Symmetry: C2
Subunit: 242 residues, 2 copies
């Protein structure tokens, strides 16, 4: 088919009599709509440990944001489109600021940055195998997670030496320059519960380094689609570049 | 002389016409009072890179909190005791909740803990040599900093193997269980400016381990006097155990 690329859409649900703590119901519903047309396709996903997507409720109307780094997978579904019914599918920025698509080429075209600010809309956490969970805006973990996602999914990965150079630059010269409205959360992400933070955080390069700045710009742009950290398929790590 | 031990005192200043942003003036004043009696003793301190104390302004009245892990050094000074005059010296908990003394033996007698909460009243930061500054409540850094201070100043240090065991336990099993009212700051600490955080943070041992729990209790108690992290002589790292 045509070239795959990252995409985000916002599903607008309106409920006549909504439950008490609606966000929790994100999973049950997404599948319901998905299963309504194609019970079959819903199955592989509920079953799969291969989750090639992020799904998170936004903070009577409930908005569920879905993103993927591969266009192709949810295209048919997008074509198809309690007391919650589906009022709108917003697949454009015009429809919703958190919806839209961007090519990998465009992401690569992203302007270089000395500083990069992120708004973490849903609890965000980092998983390190020892599994340790870090619910803090560690600059190295934020950038490293984004770089992991880029290398895993981009058609334009950095080569090993570029990658290692970037990681060492991050380790050496990337600081958290500030944070705002930081809050601790503990939420269900799949079967278990995990700690995470929300709020805003700003990363800064101590360094003047073109390579690093360009990388930072690209990774900052990627976050809109990829999210940050662990459990992104389960509503966690929704991170908007500012 | 008599056995040295940690001590904290709160100096109560009252200013008829206070400056705009009073806390900044903490250093200039502490010396002034100190120099008023003994210009000579003030000198070694302004000069010394050996700062065996912490000094921080509390958040017309300005309160300056002074602590030491060695009683002996500021005893003579304590005996002696803008439009700011010194109204009171509070050297007891009865006088002020953040003043008082505790023996090393008592600190050792501290009850074991699975969880330990700290209130960071002044911006707190960790220095790691690569110098990297971490203005976040990293559990390993909090506990490691406190253990550093204990080992450096206690008459009852852990032996090398005990210490290493503790550090590995912290690395493996210590989590940040929560945080409240976290805020980012950038403040002058001596000659330069440094980032730091304030707020409350709670550490939790995943582990049931008597050794670790006892250590956590002792370190949690020590913080009242030692502070946490870097630049404690310069108003930073004021951490109250809760
Ligand atoms: Zn389910
Ligand atoms: Zn282009
Ligand atoms: Zn755990
Ligand atoms: Zn992936
Ligand atoms: Zn992929
Ligand atoms: Zn001075
Ligand atoms: Zn006793
Ligand atoms: Zn620096
Ligand atoms: Zn020391
Ligand atoms: Zn000492």
């Amino acid at each position: 088919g045509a070239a795959s690329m990252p995409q985000a859409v916002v599903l607008e649900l309106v409920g006549e009599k909504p439950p008490l703590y609606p966000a929790r119901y994100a999973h049950g519903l997404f599948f319901a709509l998905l299963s309504r047309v194609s019970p079959e396709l819903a199955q592989k996903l509920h079953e799969a440990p291969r989750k090639p997507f992020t799904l998170a409720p936004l903070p009577g109307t409930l908005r569920l944001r879905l993103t993927t780094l591969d266009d192709g997978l949810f295209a048919p579904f997008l074509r198809a489109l309690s007391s919650y019914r589906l009022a709108r599918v917003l697949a454009t920025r015009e429809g919703h600021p958190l919806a839209g698509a961007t090519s990998w080429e465009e992401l690569k075209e992203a302007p270089k940055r000395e500083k990069a600010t992120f708004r973490f809309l849903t609890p965000t956490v980092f998983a390190t195998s020892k599994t340790r969970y870090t619910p803090l805006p560690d600059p190295r973990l934020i950038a490293g997670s984004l770089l992991d996602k880029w290398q895993a999914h981009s058609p334009f990965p950095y080569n090993p030496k570029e990658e290692a150079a970037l990681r060492e630059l991050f380790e050496l010269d990337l600081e958290v320059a500030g944070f705002r409205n930081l809050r601790f959360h503990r939420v269900q992400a799949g079967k278990g519960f995990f700690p995470g933070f929300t709020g805003e955080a700003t990363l800064r390069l101590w360094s003047q380094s073109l390579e690093a700045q360009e990388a930072l710009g690209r990774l900052h742009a990627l976050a809109f689609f990829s999210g940050v950290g662990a459990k992104t398929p389960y509503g966690m790590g929704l991170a908007v570049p500012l």
